[PDB]
Design an enzyme around this catalytic site. Structure first.
Site, PDB file in Angstrom:
ATOM      1  N   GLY A   1       3.489   3.031  10.842  1.00 47.42           N
ATOM      2  CA  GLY A   1       3.299   2.289  12.071  1.00 47.42           C
ATOM      3  C   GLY A   1       3.102   0.800  11.864  1.00 47.42           C
TER       4      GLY A   1
ATOM      5  N   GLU B   1      -1.940  -3.686   7.295  1.00 44.86           N
ATOM      6  CA  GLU B   1      -2.967  -4.715   7.502  1.00 44.86           C
ATOM      7  C   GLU B   1      -2.973  -5.789   6.417  1.00 44.86           C
ATOM      8  OE1 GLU B   1      -3.692  -1.503   6.526  1.00 44.86           O
ATOM      9  OE2 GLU B   1      -5.502  -1.465   5.279  1.00 44.86           O
TER      10      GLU B   1
ATOM     11  N   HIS C   1      -5.615  -1.616  15.572  1.00 50.94           N
ATOM     12  CA  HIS C   1      -5.946  -0.919  14.340  1.00 50.94           C
ATOM     13  C   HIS C   1      -5.834  -1.859  13.146  1.00 50.94           C
ATOM     14  CE1 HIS C   1      -5.935   2.705  11.681  1.00 50.94           C
ATOM     15  NE2 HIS C   1      -5.237   1.879  10.929  1.00 50.94           N
ATOM     16  N   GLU C   2      -4.719  -2.580  13.037  1.00 49.26           N
ATOM     17  CA  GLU C   2      -4.577  -3.476  11.891  1.00 49.26           C
ATOM     18  C   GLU C   2      -5.573  -4.628  11.939  1.00 49.26           C
ATOM     19  OE1 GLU C   2      -2.719  -1.951   9.835  1.00 49.26           O
ATOM     20  OE2 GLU C   2      -1.751  -0.696  11.386  1.00 49.26           O
TER      21      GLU C   2
ATOM     22  N   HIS D   1      -8.965  -3.535  10.683  1.00 53.59           N
ATOM     23  CA  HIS D   1      -8.952  -3.471   9.224  1.00 53.59           C
ATOM     24  C   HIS D   1      -9.444  -4.769   8.587  1.00 53.59           C
ATOM     25  CE1 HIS D   1      -7.735   0.317   7.733  1.00 53.59           C
ATOM     26  NE2 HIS D   1      -6.542   0.328   8.286  1.00 53.59           N
TER      27      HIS D   1
ATOM     28  N   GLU E   1       0.844  -1.197   0.000  1.00 46.83           N
ATOM     29  CA  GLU E   1       0.000   0.000   0.000  1.00 46.83           C
ATOM     30  C   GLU E   1       0.883   1.253   0.000  1.00 46.83           C
ATOM     31  OE1 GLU E   1      -2.610   0.452   3.360  1.00 46.83           O
ATOM     32  OE2 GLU E   1      -3.884   1.926   2.348  1.00 46.83           O
TER      33      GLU E   1
HETATM   34  O1  X4T Z   1       0.828   3.248  10.488  1.00 50.46           O
HETATM   35  C1  X4T Z   1       0.116   4.178  10.305  1.00 50.46           C
HETATM   36  C2  X4T Z   1       0.137   5.425  11.201  1.00 50.46           C
HETATM   37  N1  X4T Z   1      -0.904   6.321  10.710  1.00 50.46           N
HETATM   38  C3  X4T Z   1      -0.610   7.252   9.628  1.00 50.46           C
HETATM   39  C4  X4T Z   1       0.648   7.262   9.031  1.00 50.46           C
HETATM   40  C5  X4T Z   1       0.930   8.151   7.999  1.00 50.46           C
HETATM   41  C6  X4T Z   1      -0.038   9.049   7.582  1.00 50.46           C
HETATM   42  C7  X4T Z   1      -1.288   9.061   8.187  1.00 50.46           C
HETATM   43  C8  X4T Z   1      -1.576   8.159   9.205  1.00 50.46           C
HETATM   44  N2  X4T Z   1      -0.809   4.136   9.198  1.00 50.46           N
HETATM   45  C9  X4T Z   1      -0.775   2.923   8.407  1.00 50.46           C
HETATM   46  C10 X4T Z   1      -2.144   2.267   8.497  1.00 50.46           C
HETATM   47  O2  X4T Z   1      -3.178   2.885   8.346  1.00 50.46           O
HETATM   48  N3  X4T Z   1      -2.133   0.854   8.791  1.00 50.46           N
HETATM   49  O3  X4T Z   1      -3.343   0.192   8.911  1.00 50.46           O
HETATM   50  C11 X4T Z   1      -0.365   3.227   6.981  1.00 50.46           C
HETATM   51  C12 X4T Z   1      -0.304   2.172   6.079  1.00 50.46           C
HETATM   52  C13 X4T Z   1       0.058   2.443   4.774  1.00 50.46           C
HETATM   53  C14 X4T Z   1       0.350   3.739   4.381  1.00 50.46           C
HETATM   54 BR1  X4T Z   1       0.871   4.060   2.545  1.00 50.46          BR
HETATM   55  C15 X4T Z   1       0.278   4.794   5.281  1.00 50.46           C
HETATM   56  C16 X4T Z   1      -0.083   4.538   6.592  1.00 50.46           C
HETATM   57 ZN    ZN Z   2      -4.928   1.731   8.752  1.00 47.58          ZN
END
Ligand code: X4T
Ligand code: ZN
Length: 888
Positions: free
Chosen positions: A264, A267, A300-301, A304, A123
């Site tokens: 971070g 998923e 969070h993951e 998803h 992603e």
């Molecule tokens: O890890 C985080 C932390 N949040 C976040 C990080 C950057 C900008 C806005 C928010 N977000 C991940 C997520 O949503 N995982 O489920 C994620 C996965 C892929 C991509 Br490309 C970008 C972010």
């Molecule tokens: Zn996410």
């Protein structure tokens, strides 16, 4: 190219099946891919164009007929074009063999090597860096994936789906085949190879009683840091089962930690991949913050798996439908598991500092943008955190029962399919119709939360008729015009309210959510026995600027006696903000007029008395207490001052902190000592399943008080600082480093804590952050020492972000009027942009407020962004970010 949301169009091609062979070697990785494809009903005879970035082609074929470069296909390192004349009219096979190089992939997108682990990140647009594809999330396919590698170096091999074969290979190589029959988009594909160690458990689902295997992986060195993550996964599974009634549908879920990760976590279906700093912790080697971070990121993951993986996005413009909704589910989870009011308060404090800044900056965008050029730049606190607040207001409007009913409609109607924001609104509308008993009621106005940018302002006036026992709340909403809408419309704003009797602090009316749907309205209440104090936007019920028009005496009484944690916190915030703005203008005039003497308005004494009262309340929350002794965040304050002079703000905050310390330092010291027993209790120091969020808040309160007492130079506080450095908890001993900045023993505690931090990769990064944020006059020389002795030429995003970003919050020093601070970060952004454009863009974060500063600092920051914009090798990611940021 700029992609516009209105231009979405189904593909003219179908990809039904992906068969992959990924053979990992020392100097290169070979990807063979067979794509079982078809012509779709939208075809119009176009060329077959695959996405494909940076691939070295060995050969392509259509139906085992090798294609000739030039006459039959062009490849420009970004798009592979097979001209229509050679494209079959029915089910055909496209195959390719490409060479990629994970070992030198330092952008950490696509297939890349993190220390000794090969790992993918697809992603948003990373799969096209692995093989050719129509790399967009509506292109759903089945995946059959074989991975081979040297067995000694890569004994553990993971991809999506079921492992259906494992075979030895001559030369000490080995292989594994993974079949994942259910359709998925390609951004959810993942592969991991490495010498991985694991903890595991079996979870039995609540209803189907399915046995699910749970594995959490790390490198061998850190496998003792996996226990909390596993515990958090089980908690996440129970919550979705308990709250939403949703069970995991696969037979296995893997979580994998890697040291090099842009964000971070991710998923990927059945194969969630994590930044090590968001999966790994141990009480000996992590700060308290890691335990809430792992809980939220694992949750969070997991969430998803339904909101993102089972219900899919049609296109990237629907991003907030999976990210905003998953953050909302994440927040509901964390609130339930921590059981502390500061969990919700921490999300508001993030939204109102970071996201409000973005939404009044030139980067402002609605949670569903209308266009993009860099898909990676789409991932923002607006899309995530305002998205979650918009997702949360459905729950406020509907209540828990009808919210759950609407969420269930959404999952049932759309499971296994793609969806859009409108689909979710429709599901909620069905629940709104049932709740209103009115099948003519609708949520069409609510859609503006998705399309309208900027932060609404909500303001109040009040009237009480004593003879009539009649109370009236007049409400106004207003959104500033910006580049996205010249004329802003009124949003559906739900305002959770109570009425406090100022005599006895009791609630005067039942639960009540005002539905403001017009630019202005008057809400009247009868049988109001005495003039109330209104408690407005309880829980922070809408993502807005709240202008409560209350007196400080009214705000003090809410702070002492209101039932809602957020309104107490916000009432305190507002008292501070009034004081900050007053003293700021007073310092500013004295500076502008070159006054030789002048006056400052002191801090309200009844306010200080109220803080003391709450601090001395044994039955009050330690986490809440730590919020009331802290001035609002600098990036919250900046939303309220034009041409902000950061030195004058530094002087303002200093005066206000000193005023309160001069009355309350003895209280601060008494509490810091009486809190030691319970805050630093070691009873469960060696149980990684025992996590106590109240106790961790008690440590936060101690470490906040210690910082205040140290800055104030309280008599003999250096004794307390040295004794704190001996604590087993890193939150305590890293705190002792930062607060010792004010003392001659700083560099003695620098060396002490470095020696304690250097043997754990993640603990060292926390040490870097602590040094970086140290309030030091020699902070520029200390950063140069970090660069030369510790950071060196590391490309690890955790290392770079740890050295530089905390420093950027140093109000006096980062904003040094020479520009040396802006110049230092600009150099780091440009250096990092050569190998990791996404992290380069993250390092621009301090510049987002550039046009809110005094005219001199505006000019300094703009000069640096114009210098980075002029770098001949600038990434698309960074160029487009900085062009938007500077309004070009
Ligand atoms: O890890 C985080 C932390 N949040 C976040 C990080 C950057 C900008 C806005 C928010 N977000 C991940 C997520 O949503 N995982 O489920 C994620 C996965 C892929 C991509 Br490309 C970008 C972010
Ligand atoms: Zn996410």
């Amino acid at each position: 190219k700029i992609h516009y949301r209105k231009d979405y169009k189904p593909s003219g091609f179908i990809i039904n099946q992906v068969t992959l062979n990924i053979n990992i070697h020392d100097q290169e990785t070979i990807v063979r891919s067979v794509l079982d494809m078809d012509i779709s009903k939208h075809n119009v005879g176009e060329d077959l164009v695959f996405d494909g970035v940076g691939l070295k082609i060995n050969e392509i074929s259509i139906n085992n007929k090798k294609l000739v470069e030039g006459e039959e296909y062009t490849y420009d390192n970004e798009f592979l074009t097979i001209f229509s004349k050679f494209v079959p009219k029915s089910k055909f096979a496209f195959s390719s063999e490409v060479i990629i190089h994970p070992e030198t992939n330092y952008a950490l997108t696509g297939l890349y090597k993190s220390k000794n682990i090969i790992v993918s990140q697809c992603e948003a647009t990373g799969f096209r860096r692995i093989t050719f594809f129509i790399d967009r999330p509506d292109m759903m396919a089945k995946y059959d994936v074989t991975v081979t590698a040297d067995k000694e170096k890569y004994p553990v091999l993971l991809s999506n789906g079921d492992k259906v074969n494992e075979f030895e290979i001559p030369g000490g190589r080995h292989g594994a085949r993974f079949n994942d029959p259910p359709l998925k988009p390609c951004y959810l594909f993942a592969v991991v190879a490495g010498d991985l160690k694991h903890l595991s458990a079996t979870y039995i689902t609540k209803y189907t009683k399915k046995k699910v295997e749970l594995y959490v992986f790390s490198e061998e060195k850190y496998v003792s840091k996996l226990q909390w993550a596993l515990e958090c996964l089980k908690k996440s599974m129970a919550f979705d089962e308990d709250y939403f009634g949703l069970e995991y549908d696969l037979s296995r879920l893997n979580l994998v930690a890697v040291s090099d990760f842009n964000v971070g976590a991710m998923e990927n279906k059945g194969l969630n991949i994590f930044n090590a700093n968001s999966l790994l912790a141990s009480k000996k080697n992590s700060i308290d913050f890691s335990y809430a971070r792992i809980l939220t990121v694992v949750g969070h993951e997991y969430f998803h798996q339904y909101t993102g993986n089972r219900v899919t996005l049609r296109d990237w413009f629907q991003l907030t439908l999976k990210e905003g909704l998953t953050v909302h589910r994440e927040n509901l989870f964390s609130e339930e598991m921590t059981k502390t009011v500061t969990t919700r308060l921490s999300h508001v404090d993030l939204l109102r500092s970071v996201q409000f800044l973005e939404d009044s900056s030139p980067l402002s965008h609605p949670i569903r943008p209308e266009s993009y050029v860099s898909m990676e730049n789409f991932y923002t606190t607006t899309v995530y955190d305002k998205g979650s607040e918009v997702m949360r207001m459905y729950l406020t409007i509907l209540g828990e029962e009808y919210y759950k009913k609407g969420f269930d409609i959404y999952i049932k109607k759309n499971d296994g399919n793609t969806a859009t924001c409108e689909d979710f609104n429709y599901a909620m509308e069905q629940a709104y119709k049932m709740k209103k008993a009115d099948n003519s009621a609708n949520l069409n106005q609510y859609l503006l939360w998705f399309s309208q940018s900027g932060t609404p302002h909500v303001s109040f006036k009040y009237n009480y008729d004593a003879e009539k026992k009649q109370y009236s709340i007049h409400v106004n909403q207003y959104t500033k015009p910006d580049e996205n809408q010249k004329e802003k419309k009124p949003l559906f704003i739900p305002i959770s309210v109570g009425l406090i009797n100022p005599e006895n602090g009791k609630e005067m009316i039942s639960q009540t959510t005002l539905e403001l749907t017009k630019e202005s309205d008057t809400f009247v209440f009868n049988n109001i026995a005495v003039k109330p104090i209104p408690s407005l936007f309880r829980g922070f019920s809408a993502p807005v600027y709240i202008e409560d028009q209350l007196t400080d005496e009214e705000r003090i009484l809410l702070l002492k006696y209101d039932s809602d944690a957020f309104v107490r916190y916000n009432s305190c915030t507002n008292i501070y903000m009034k004081q900050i703005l007053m003293n700021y203008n007073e310092f500013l005039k004295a500076k502008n007029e070159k006054l030789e003497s002048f006056q400052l308005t002191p801090v309200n004494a009844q306010f200080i008395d109220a803080i003391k009262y709450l601090l001395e309340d044994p039955h009050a929350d330690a986490g809440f207490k730590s919020y009331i002794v802290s001035l609002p965040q600098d990036r919250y304050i900046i939303n309220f001052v034009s041409n902000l002079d950061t030195d004058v703000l530094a002087d303002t905050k200093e005066y206000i902190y000193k005023q309160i310390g001069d009355k309350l330092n003895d209280v601060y010291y008494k509490m810091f000592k009486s809190l030691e027993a319970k805050a630093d209790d070691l009873t469960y120091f060696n149980d990684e399943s025992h996590v106590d969020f109240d106790q961790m808040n008690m440590r936060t309160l101690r470490n906040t008080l210690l910082s205040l007492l140290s800055k104030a130079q309280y008599p003999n506080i250096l004794n307390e600082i040295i004794e704190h450095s001996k604590s087993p908890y890193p939150s305590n001993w890293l705190t002792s480093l930062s607060v010792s900045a004010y003392f001659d023993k700083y560099f003695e505690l620098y060396d002490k804590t470095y020696k304690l931090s250097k043997d754990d990769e993640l603990l060292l990064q926390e040490w870097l952050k602590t040094v970086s944020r140290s309030d030091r006059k020699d902070i520029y020389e200390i950063l140069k020492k970090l660069e030369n002795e510790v950071l060196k030429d590391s490309k690890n995003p955790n290392d770079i972000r740890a050295v530089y970003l905390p420093f950027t919050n140093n109000l006096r020093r980062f904003h040094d009027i020479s520009g040396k601070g802006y110049k230092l970060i600009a150099e780091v952004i440009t250096k990092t942009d050569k190998f990791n454009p996404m992290v380069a863009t993250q390092l621009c974060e301090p510049f987002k407020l550039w046009n809110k500063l005094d005219t001199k600092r505006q000019e300094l920051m703009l000069n640096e962004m114009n210098t980075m914009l002029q770098e001949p090798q600038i990434s698309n990611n960074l160029k487009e970010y900085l062009l938007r940021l500077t309004n070009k």
